[PDB]
Paper text:
As the most abundant viral protein encoded by the M gene segment, [name] (M1) forms a shell underneath a host cell-derived lipid biolayer to connect the vRNPs with the viral envelope in mature virions. The full-length M1 protein includes 252 amino acids consisting of a highly organized N-terminal domain and a flexible but less ordered C-terminal domain that are linked by a protease-sensitive loop. So far, only the N-terminal domain of M1 has been structurally resolved at an atomic level, showing that at neutral pH the physiological monomers have a high tendency to oligomerize via a so-called ‘face-to-back’ arrangement, whereas at acidic pH the N-terminal domain exists as a dimeric structure in a so-called ‘face-to-face’ arrangement.
However, the G88E mutation causes M1 to be trapped in a face-to-face orientation regardless of pH that consequently resulted in inefficient virus growth and genetic instability. Surprisingly, M([name]-88E)-neutral dimerizes in a face-to-face manner at neutral pH in contrast to a face-to-back monomer–monomer arrangement as possessed by wt-M11EA3 (pH 7.0) and M([name]-88R)-neutral. A further look at M([name]-88E)-neutral structure reveals that the G88E mutation results in three inter-subunit salt-bridge/hydrogen-bond interactions including Lys104-NZ to Glu88-OE1 (and its symmetry-related counterpart) and Arg134-NE to Glu88-OE2 that may explain why M([name]-88E)-neutral that is predicted to crystallize as monomers in a face-to-back arrangement is actually driven to dimerize in a face-to-face manner at neutral pH. Interactions between the monomers that form the face-to-face dimer in M([name]-88R)-acidic, M([name]-88E)-acidic or M([name]-88E)-neutral involve hydrophobic contacts (mainly between the symmetry-related helices H6, and between helices H9 and loops L9), as well as several hydrogen-bond and/or salt-bridge interactions. However, M([name]-88E) M1 is trapped in a face-to-face-oriented conformation irrespective of environmental pH. In the case of M([name]-88E)-neutral with misshapen face-to-face monomer–monomer interactions that seem unfavorable for M1 oligomerization, a thin, uneven and broken M1 layer still forms beneath the M([name]-88E) viral envelope as exhibited in our TEM images. This could be due to the presence of the C terminus that may provide sufficient stabilization for a malformed M1 layer.
Numbering used by the authors:
A (entry chain B): 1 to 69, 75 to 161
B (entry chain A): -5 to 69, 75 to 158
The structure:
């Protein structure tokens, strides 16, 4: 699907360049192509990768948890970060909005108004309330969060 | 550190919880469960939680509070508890719930914590519990108790 391939592109955009990036991709694709499952061994593999910042692991964990038909703590930790107020004050308002969105694009457009921090905080909390938004909308958020992070790594 | 709570505090907490449960034999059962779990009668959470989930009479909200408490004192996280506490997710209950959530991370006394929590509505508090429920390590156990009691007081007051 164009959508899944688009998401994966956004997701992949934050992983550092290397062989892992191509491995992480293959996984994302098998998961997308409807192949196997056992998110367990997947999250296990995912939580033991050397080079991936914790935030990258959280987002990947979120994505896999979202695409693979259980609330691992390393996913919750990395996403919530320092639970810095405001980040949490925004993610809550972003969250209340996303509950009303239905399209991947309506969702990504709004989520891109918020900072990387509040976004990760918004993902981290929807990770506990996964049925609060649709999969597409959730995707919109993920993508928006990867562009905000990619742009943060840019301002160097 | 250590996980010893004074039997006075536990009975304090126990009377607040019990304040929202309707009289009847069920309430007497809950008291038993709550007390011998306060004493630490080698209790199993999954059992308790399952029992708690399948109980009649009890409103969802009361099941969430009791569920929060048991998890708090006994050594997976349920769902009926999250829905119960979270419930409605009013975009304001959550606003306040997050602000309270951050203040309690710097609190250390059941009293100090229960003192602040009361400055909030039964709704925000319930959402705050819902938050800590997925982050029981954010605040200490006694502080968590303060929130529970302040929450039980607020609803027993709206009643």
């Amino acid at each position: 699907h164009s959508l899944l391939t688009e998401v994966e592109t956004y997701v992949l955009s934050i992983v550092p360049s290397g062989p892992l990036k191509a491995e992480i991709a293959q996984r994302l694709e098998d998961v997308f192509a409807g192949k196997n499952t056992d998110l367990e061994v997947l999250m296990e593999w995912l939580k033991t990768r050397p080079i991936l910042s914790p935030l990258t692991k959280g987002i990947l964990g979120f994505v896999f948890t979202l695409t693979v038909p259980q609330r691992r703590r390393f996913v919750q930790n990395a996403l919530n970060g320092n639970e810095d107020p405001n980040n949490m004050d925004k993610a809550v308002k972003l969250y209340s909005k996303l509950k009303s969105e239905i399209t991947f694009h309506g969702a990504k457009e709004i989520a891109l108004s918020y900072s990387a921090g509040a976004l990760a905080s918004c993902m981290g909390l929807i990770y506990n309330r996964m049925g609060a938004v649709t999969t597409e909308v959730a995707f919109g958020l993920v993508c928006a969060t990867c562009e905000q992070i990619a742009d943060s790594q840019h301002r160097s």
